[PDB]
């Protein structure tokens, strides 16, 4: 199924799978982390629904689906954020009613360095004029890639399938860039520039997790392990 | 001004700049590993000066990039020379360690397993030497970037051009070329991850000044 999709059909499925932009509740420095936490927790629900619609993801065992989301969920939140913030220089659009600047990040101990890395990524996307079709491909790469090196004959089968699906998303990115008129050299170069940004998003996720710990497996299984009823 | 080399000249320069394999100074694991890494750093600086385009950056930026990249560079080198040693990491020719030795150091075995998994990934893609040296140069120029930045990106673009060249020269289709390029660059996010976890581990147990002093030999 997923391996038979054309590039156009991959783009469409990913665009359709997109989760909604959530809001914060209808503010002060003291309630800031509570609001961000509440937002991230509501976004996780929609993240599971989205991941189940990424072609190939539901072909995996539930254990492997849990592993991939457990590895990727914060990178996925962050790339969503930097995407939402791209048109808001110097600000992070956590939600439409929760647009924060650097100074508001100061107030939470540990956060401004991460806030600064997020802002620079959003500036980098803005410089590259990142398109929504490219965004959804990158977010799907993160889902399938971040946990794939921390996993039997079934496991061997699973990893091959993941890499085949990753290869299809690469084909899709290149097709988008060719459709946009880029020369072949420019296509390869832009693919590389986008994927190297994924290393920076990994970096920010690890710094973020350290920060979050200074202040999940079963929960993901519960949401992922639905009945058929 | 390194933007003028051809792909073959870029490969040849990278291959010729490769550092030597050092031995473990002995004749206490973490002390040995610490001693080795500190001696390898010197040779890493000499290597970096030969990466085309690097020296065209200010010293401040040269230092900044090395400070951000050095553990990732040590790790990918470790993974590369451990390929032919399944289940073991060849820290040095006289310092070949397996998991249970890694387990002896509280907080190491998880990253030890990640390193082992990376070397198995390299062995299973049949990573080539010309590819490896391109990947290390990318780590150097990319890890700390987030006119000077323009230049860094413009060298990074030159390395992507070179990778595609090597793959085309191997007979890969255009589709296979961009597929493998992507697989290689996604491995760099796992190398970043292992460096992040390694730094947390090492620190649970300034550098710029030391790097400056190394650039004076
Ligand atoms: O503030 C958060 C955040 C807060 C709490 C989180 O975890 C809450 C615990 N919960 C456990 C179950 C899984 C979901 C998270 C995660 C992110 C967000 C981010 C962050 C930024 C800097 C930093 O140092 C740390 C985090 S990035 C982000 C993007 C969002 O869409 C929502 C919240 C956020
Ligand atoms: O064990 C080390 C190691 C030990 C000490 C180090 O740093 C010592 C501090 N030193 C201060 C001056 C700057 C250079 C670092 C670095 C790596 C190596 C590694 C490691 C693996 C797992 C893990 O959890 C932590 C580290 S990987 C590696 C590759 C090498 O070529 C050499 C040492 C190593």
Numbering used by the authors:
A (entry chain A): 306 to 331, 337 to 461, 465 to 528, 536 to 549
B (entry chain B): 306 to 332, 341 to 459, 470 to 528, 535 to 546
Give me lines lifted from the publication on this model.
The pro-oncogenic cellular activities of estrogen receptor alpha (ERα) drive breast cancer pathogenesis. Ligand-dependent transcriptional activities depend on the association of coactivator proteins with ERα to form functional complexes. SERMs and SERDs elicit a structural rearrangement of the ERα LBD to sterically preclude binding of coactivators in the activating function-2 cleft. Activating somatic mutations near ERα helix 12, Y537S and D538G, enable hormone therapy resistance in metastatic ER +breast cancers.
(C) Hydrogen bond formed between E380 and S537 in Chain A of Y537S-RAL. BZA, RAL, and RU39411 show the greatest burial at 379.75, 377.87, and 325.21 Å respectively. These molecules engaged a new S537-E380 hydrogen bond that enforced a well-ordered antagonistic H12 conformation that corresponded to significant surface area burial within the AF-2 cleft.
